[PDB]
């Protein structure tokens, strides 16, 4: 596509510049171009891909929630019996959000997941597949909603199975996966008890493995453990 004439290394360099400049749409476009070169991504490069699209979709999710809230009030008992504009603009933002998610899912399917054989890469990509199906589920109605939810679940579950076999309980990718799957259970799947159980087991198993870690690894793992605790405090 548009980045087809730019060197892979230049795309990566410019993605890092875009991050520094808080130009996340540019960052995502550079990283999409890098993926489309066809080579596997290094750990650092996977992280750049994730940061770029997390920030793009994050702005869209925040906007969608604002507009959805306004739309719910306007169709409350006796509010602005107004025109189609709120719905139209919410729908515009929704379609753009869905397009970003579809783009990410398309990169994962062509061909990042299939060429990912190491546990770190495969878990990372499967987690990302679950996350972007989850973002689709946040806005979904109509006949395929259940199916979007099951796609998220299936991706997270395959990631979980690999992570438990192949990674220690403090591994940051394993922890972030468990955190996000617990959010899926609580916010998407109407399964708060499963969410709570998963967060607690994850936290406790990580705590028992901290003794194996260096000072730097300890810092990385405990940061994510605190997010598990923060959710448990919200949920219980």
């Amino acid at each position: 596509g548009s980045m087809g004439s730019m060197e892979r290394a230049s795309l990566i360099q410019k993605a890092k510049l875009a991050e520094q400049a808080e130009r996340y749409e540019d960052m995502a476009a550079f990283m999409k171009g890098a993926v489309e070169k066809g080579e596997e991504l290094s750990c650092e490069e996977r992280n750049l891909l994730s940061v770029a699209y997390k920030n793009v979709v994050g702005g869209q999710r925040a906007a969608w929630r604002v507009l959805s809230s306004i739309e719910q009030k306007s169709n409350e008992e006796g509010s602005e019996e107004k025109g189609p504009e709120v719905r139209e603009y919410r729908e515009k933002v929704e379609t753009e959000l869905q397009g970003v998610c579809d783009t990410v899912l398309g990169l994962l399917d062509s061909h990042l997941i299939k060429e990912a054989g190491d546990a770190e890469s495969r878990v990372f990509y499967l987690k990302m597949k679950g996350d972007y199906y989850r973002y689709l589920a946040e806005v979904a109605t109509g006949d395929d909603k259940k199916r979007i939810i099951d796609s998220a679940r299936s991706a997270y579950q395959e990631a979980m199975d690999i992570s438990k076999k192949e990674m220690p309980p403090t591994n940051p990718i394993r922890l972030g996966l468990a955190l996000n799957f617990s959010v899926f259970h609580y916010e998407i799947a109407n399964s708060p008890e499963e969410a709570i159980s998963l967060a607690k087991t994850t936290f406790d198993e990580a705590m028992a493995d901290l003794h194996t870690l260096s000072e730097d690894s300890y810092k990385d793992s405990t940061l994510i453990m605190q997010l598990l605790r923060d959710n448990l405090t919200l949920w219980t």
């Binding site: 940061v51 997390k54 972030g176 955190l179 996000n180 916010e187 940061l223």
Partner: peptide, 10 residues
């Protein structure tokens, strides 16, 4: 408040 998720870094 919505639940907190995580990717890469804070």
């Amino acid at each position: 408040r919505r639940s907190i998720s995580f990717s890469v870094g804070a």
